[PDB]
From Swiss-Prot, chains B, E:
Phosphorylated by ZraS. ATP binds at residues 34-35, 191, 221. Residues 3-232 form the Sigma-54 factor interaction domain. Activity of the ZraS/ZraR two-component system is repressed by the zinc-bound form of ZraP, which probably interacts with the periplasmic region of ZraS. It comes from the Bacteria. The keyword NADP does not apply. It is found in: Cytoplasm. GO terms for molecular function: ATP binding; ATP hydrolysis activity; cis-regulatory region sequence-specific DNA binding; DNA-binding transcription activator activity. Its main location: cytoplasm. This is Transcriptional regulatory protein ZraR. Part of the Zra signaling pathway, an envelope stress response (ESR) system composed of the periplasmic accessory protein ZraP, the histidine kinase ZraS and the transcriptional regulator ZraR. The ZraPSR system contributes to antibiotic resistance and is important for membrane integrity in the presence of membrane-targeting biocides. ZraR is a member of the two-component regulatory system ZraS/ZraR. When activated by ZraS, acts in conjunction with sigma-54 to regulate the expression of zraP in the presence of high Zn(2+) or Pb(2+) concentrations. One of its GO terms (biological process) is positive regulation of DNA-templated transcription. Keywords: Activator, ATP-binding, Cytoplasm, DNA-binding, Nucleotide-binding, Phosphoprotein, Stress response, Transcription, Transcription regulation, Two-component regulatory system.
Curated annotation (Swiss-Prot), chains C, F:
Coiled coil: none annotated. Residues 2-228 form the Sigma-54 factor interaction domain. The chain holds residues 141 to 441 of 441 of the full protein. Phosphorylated by ZraS. It comes from the Bacteria. It is found in: Cytoplasm. The keyword Iron does not apply. This is Transcriptional regulatory protein ZraR. Residues 272-291 bind DNA. Keywords: Activator, ATP-binding, Cytoplasm, DNA-binding, Nucleotide-binding, Phosphoprotein, Stress response, Transcription, Transcription regulation, Two-component regulatory system.
C-alpha cells in the first residue's frame, strides 16, 4: 500500500502520479508484467480526490466475452446457464468511485465496443433489458501490450484507445530502481519469515548485492518468488547466496 | 446545425445535409472513423421532417449475427437465452421516425438480406413468427469501409449496397478542415477546463499553430484526447506546446 | 409490368411466352440487378396457374435450418406454434425460389427429392405429404461451375437446368434505358412531390451509355438520388452519381500541373530549360512545381 | 418399374440380377451417378423372394449424423430438439422385407459402426434405451464411390465394407446401352408430353440419332432433363434437333 | 475354446489364453482388425473364473467423448439430451463380472484419465454427482493400434498404457495361420449353405488351395465374405475357383 | 511409504524434509511414472498440517468448466444440487494439484488469484469466500518452455516454481530396483495367491539395467505380468515383458541366413564362390538363399 522508491526513474514515476491523479482523467498504465502496476493504480486512487470512496478492481485476464460482460456490467435472472439472482455489476459498484481494470489489452471487440459507451456516455446497460443506468466512475486501465500496435494491428479500436490513453503512465522495471530492491527486499523477507513462522532476519551482504543487481525479467513477481524461496529453504537466520534461486549465479 | 461551422468542406457538408434531409431518402455516411458521422446523423434527423419523432439508433459494431437480429428486429418468447419477455425492436421503435445504424459494414450476410427486406418492402418479421409488422422508417447509415470494395470482394451485396447508397455524404477528415480546428479546439478546451474546475483560457499562438497542422490520424477522437490531456496537465492558464502530446504531432 | 423494346429485351419476351405452359421447371440466370423476379412473375402470369397463388421465397442466406422449415415445414410440434411450408403453400401453384445457388448440400438433396417425386416430408417426422408444384428458380451463379467445383450437384442441377432463360444486362439493352429512365423519373418525382420533368440531353446521354454493373437497381438508385437533389426542373450531369462521369471529376492543381510539366518534359527530351520556356515559367519554378 | 434393356453390357447386368437376387445376400450397387441404380435395386427386390413384402428405401445423401441415426434406427420422445412421439425406424419398418439405402459412401464413421451391428447381429437399438430390437432385413446399398478406396483412405471401414460388398453389381452407363435410349426415350417423351398436356408424338429421325448417340455424363438424369426440355419447348408435334439441349451439337 | 483350433500360432494363443485367465489381470488384445479379438475376449471370459457372471462389453468405436462417458460410466438426470431416466452404466453393470472394451485406441484424452481411474482406484463417479460407486471388474481391451506409438506420439498416455498392457495377446493374422484356413473355410461353408437352403458341400481341391494361400488383408472378415459370396453364386455342389472373388486372390 | 536408499533417492528425501515446513508452495517436476503423488504425500506428512485432511485433485484432462467448479466450486444454485470446492475443502490444509501444466489460461489466471490473494469466488457469482492453503502441484512439463511458447504464464509460473523438487528416474536409482522389484513381487504373488519367491539372477540382472521409460509404473507392470504368467517358483527372463531383452528375440531363419551369407560376402570381397565354399553350400544355393 505504498512503494519503495527513488532511484531516478522511480522518482519521475512518483512525479507523474502526483501531478496527474486529480480525479477526472482516465489513466493508462503501460509496462511489462512484473512491475507494480497494480500498486501504481493504488497510488493513483489514493493521491487525488476519491481517496475515501471505494476502489473497485477486476482483472480482465482470461474471462470469456460472456463472463466478462456480466462481471463488468450488470446482469439479471435471465442469463443462460442456471443462475437467477440479479447481479449488479462493477461499473455501478464503483459509481462515484474508481474502477481499475487490469490486463485490458485483450478484451474482445464487443467488449471494447461496450467498454467504450461505458466511458463515452455515462450509461451502463445490464446484461439484459434497457437498464440504461448511468454512472460516474474514474477509470484506470493497465496493460502490458502496445495498445498503439493493437490498434494498427486491427485488434483494438481507436475510439477506445483514444479514450483510455488520455494520461499515460509508463511503469519502470525493477532494474530501473535498483535503489529500492534492498528495502523492497526486506519487506517480503518479513512477510514470509512470518508466514512460515521461521526465525529469519537479515540478508548476508553478499546475497543482497546479487539481489540489488539482478531481478530483471519478472521484476517484483520474480524477486517475491526468489525470496519466499530462500526463507523456506533457510536453515538458520540470514538468507545467503546458496538460498537464492539458481538464476542468481546462473545469470553472470 | 450541431457541429463547429465552416471551412470549405465543412460548408459543403452542411450544404449537402440541408438539401437532402426531407424524409424519404436513405442516407449513407461514409468516412474515416473519428469524425462526426453521428452528429451528421442527428443533424440529418433534425433538419428535415420527422424532427419531432424520436431518433432510434443502434450500433452494429460487434453484435453477433444473433443479438443484432433481435436487437434490430423482433423477438418474443423465442430466442431462449434465459428470460424471454418480448422485445419489440428497433425498426418498429422508430416507426414513423428515424433509424441510424452505425458501423453497418461488417454485418453478416444474412443480416444484409434482412436489412434489405426492411428497406425494400417495409415489413419486419421477428425472431420467430410470421409477425409481419409494417414500419415506415427513414434510414441513415454509416461506415468506415469502402462498401464498394466490399461489394466487389464478395463480402457485401449490391442490392443492399444500392438501397443504402442512394444519397451519399463523405465525412471530411480533420485535415480536410484545418479552418475549423481552432474553433473545434476552444470547444474542447471549455468542456474539460470546466470538467476539472480548472481556470484555463486560450492556447499560446504557438501551440495553436501546431494543433492547426496536425490531428490527422484519429480526427476528432484524437484531438479530443490531445486537449483534455493538456487541460489535465496545465499548471496555470494557457495550454502551450509542452502540454500537448509529444506524439509525433511535432515528431 | 416490364418495360421493353430493344432486341435482347424482345428475345426475352419471346422466350417467356414460348416456355410458360406449366409442367416444366425454369431456372433463371443473370447478374443480380435485373428483373429476374419479374421474369418469374411474367412466367407465372402466362400459361395456366394464372389464377392460383404464387408462393415465392428467397433462399437469401437463411441458415440451413430455417430454410428447411420455411421451405418444407414442421407442421407437427417439432420446435417448441406451427408453420405449414412453402412447397405445400404452392401445391397446385407455382413456386419461385430465388438465389438458389447457395442452398446447402442437404437442401440440394431435399429440394431434389421434392422435385423428383412429388412428396414433402416435414422436418424430423414422417408426415409423408404429397404435392405438385411448377418450379421456378433463379441465381446469379455459374451452376455448372458450382457442380464441377463440387458445391452443387448434378442431379438437382440437371433437374433445374431444364429450361434456361438468360436475363440480359442493361448494357445489352441501351435502347430501353431512356424509356426505363423515364419510368423512375416519374416514380420519384412523385414520391418526393417534386416537380421534375425531363433529363438534359447531356445527362440522358451518359445514362444511355452507362448503367452497367447493377443494372436496373443501380439506375433506380441513380435517378432517385437525382430527384432527391434536383433544385430545378431537369436532372443533369451534376445530379447523377459521380460514378457515371483520365476522368471527369475535378483533380487538384498540384497534380494537374505535374501532369502538364511532365508532358512538356516528355515533348522536349527531358530538357528542363526548354520545358519551362514553353511552359511560360522559370527553370527554377518547374524545378519546384514538381518537387512539391 | 422395369428397364429398357439389351445391348451387351445391358444384358450382362440382367444376367447378374437374375442370378443373385435370391434373398439373403446383401448387395452393393456400384457406378457413376446418372444410371438407374435405384431401378436395379427395384429389380432386385422384385426378382427373388420378398417380392410381396415391403421395400423400404432411404437415401443417406446429406442427412447429418443425427437425423440419419434416427431415420435409420429408432427413436423415442427423449430427443433434443422438441419432438416427442416415438419414431419406429426404418430397419424395423423393413423387418422381414428389404431395405435400400442409397448413396452410402459418405455416412459418418459412427453410422458405419452402427450400420455394421445392424448387419452384424440382427439387433437395432432405438435412439435411446436398450431397445435391443432384433430384426431381419435383406439389405441393398448403392453408391458411386470407390468403397475400396474409401477404406484405404481410412474414411470407411473394412468390417462394414466386407459386409456390404458381398455381391456386387456394377451399373453400366447410358453409353453402354445405346440400344435402349430410343425406347427409353419414348417413355419420357410420353410422361411429359402429358404432364404439360401437350400434344406430342415421335422424334424426328435426326434427333433420335443424336440422342442414341449422346447422353453420356448424367445418363438417365441427363436425357430425362434433355427431353422434358424439348416437350416444353416444342411448338408442334415431333421433337427435333433444335429442341434438344445445346450439348447435343455442342458435343461433336 | 470357441475358435477353430490349431496351427502353431493358433496353438500358442490358446496357450496364452489358458495361462492368463484367472481373473485379476487386465488384458490387452492387439492385432490387425479382422481377426477374432472378440472371440478371444469371450474365450478369456469363459476360461477363467467369473465364468458364471455376465460379460458386459461395449465398443468404443466412434462414440463422442460424451456418449462414451455416460455409456461407460454413470449418468442420472444430468446429461440433459432429452429424457433423463437414470442410466446405470457399464462398469457397474459388470461389477463382479468381466468388461470388454473394443477399439479402445482412439478414445479421447479425458476418457483416458477416467478409464484409468476406473482401473486404478476401483471407484466410478457418474456424469454429474460425487456418486462414487465402487466396482470390481476384470478388464479386457482390444485395439488395432500400436498403443506404444500412440503413447510416444503423445496421443495416448503411459499410465493407462501401462495398466492395460499388463498381459498382452497378439492376435495372429489369417496368413500367420494357414493351417486353420481350411478348417475355418468349411465352417463358413456350412453356415451360408444353410442360410441359403443350398445343398453345398466341399471345395474343389483347386479352390481350396488358393483359399489356403490368400485371405490376407482382411483376415476373417474377408474370408467370411469371400465364401458366402461363393455359396450365393454356386450353381451346383462344390464351390470352385470360379465362385471365389476374382479379387486379386489370384491376381 | 517410499522405498529408498540409493544416492538420488537419498537426495530427494533430504529435500522433502528440508522444505516441508508449511508456508511455501512446492512444484514437482519429473517424468510421469515416478512417485510424484507420493512425494507430495511425504511433503504433506512432514511439517505441520500433518493432521489436517489432504485435498488432492488431478487436473487430468477436465474441461475448463468442470475443472473450474471442482476446483473452486459453485456452491450457489448455478447449474441446475451443489459442490463446495477443493481449495475451500483444504482451507487450513494442503492442496495437491496434479498435472498442472495443461490447465487452460483462464484457469491459470484463477489459480493465481487464488494463490496471490487468498480469496476464492465461486463460479458466476460474487460469493467472495476467503482461504489459506499450502500448495503442492506437479507436472511433467517444461514449465519455462510452456511460458516462452506462450501457453503458460509467468505470474503463475513464478508463484509455482518457488520450491523445486526434481523426481529422479529409475535409471537414476538402479540400486533401488531390486528392493523395489521385491516389493511388487510380494504384492502380486499375494494378489494372485501364487507362491512365488525370488528372481533368477538372470532376470534380476536385466531388471537392474533397464526399467526406464515408465519408471515405476512400467516395472510395476512388468512384474505383475511376470507373476501372472509364472508356472514355477522363480520369475525369469522368459516371463519379463519382451521389451526388457541386434536383439534377443527370435528372428526368422530366412533372415538370419541372409544376414550370414552377406557377412561372408563382405569378408571375401563379394566373391560369391568363396563365400559359398566357406559357407559350406553350392554357389547356386547362396545365389538362391538370398534371392528369396
Amino acid at each position: 500500500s505504498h512503494m519503495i522508491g527513488s532511484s531516478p526513474a522511480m522518482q519521475h514515476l512518483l512525479n507523474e502520479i502526483a501531478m496527474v491523479a486529480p480525479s477526472d482523467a482516465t489513466v493508462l498504465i503501460h509496462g511489462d508484467s512484473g512491475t507494480g502496476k497494480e500498486l501504481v493504480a493504488r497510488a493513483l486512487h489514493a493521491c487525488s480526490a476519491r481517496s475515501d470512496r471505494p476502489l473497485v478492481t477486476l482483472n480482465c485476464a482470461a474471462l470469456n466475452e460472456s463472463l466478462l460482460e456480466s462481471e463488468l456490467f450488470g446482469h439479471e435472472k435471465g442469463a443462460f446457464t442456471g443462475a437467477d439472482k440479479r447481479r449488479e455489476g462493477r461499473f455501478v459498484e464503483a459509481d462515484g468511485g474508481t474502477l481499475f481494470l487490469d490486463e485490458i489489452g485483450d478484451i474482445s471487440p464487443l467488449m471494447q465496443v461496450r467498454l467504450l459507451r461505458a466511458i463515452q456516455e455515462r450509461e451502463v446497460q445490464r446484461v439484459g433489458s434497457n437498464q440504461t443506468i448511468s454512472v460516474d466512475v474514474r477509470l484506470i486501465a493497465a496493460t502490458h501490450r502496445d495498445l498503439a500496435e493493437e490498434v494498427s494491428a486491427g485488434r483494438f479500436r481507436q475510439d477506445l484507445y483514444y479514450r483510455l490513453n488520455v494520461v499515460a503512465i509508463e511503469m519502470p522495471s525493477l532494474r530501473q530502481r535498483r535503489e529500492d530492491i534492498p528495502l523492497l527486499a526486506d519487506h517480503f523477507l518479513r512477510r514470509f519469515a512470518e508466514r512460515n513462522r521461521k526465525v529469519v532476519k537479515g540478508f548476508t551482504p553478499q546475497a543482497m548485492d546479487l539481489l540489488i543487481h539482478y531481478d530483471w525479467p519478472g521484476n517484483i513477481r520474480e524477486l517475491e518468488n526468489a525470496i519466499e524461496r530462500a526463507v523456506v529453504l533457510l536453515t538458520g537466520e540470514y538468507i545467503s547466496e546458496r538460498e537464492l534461486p539458481l538464476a542468481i549465479a546462473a545469470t553472470p
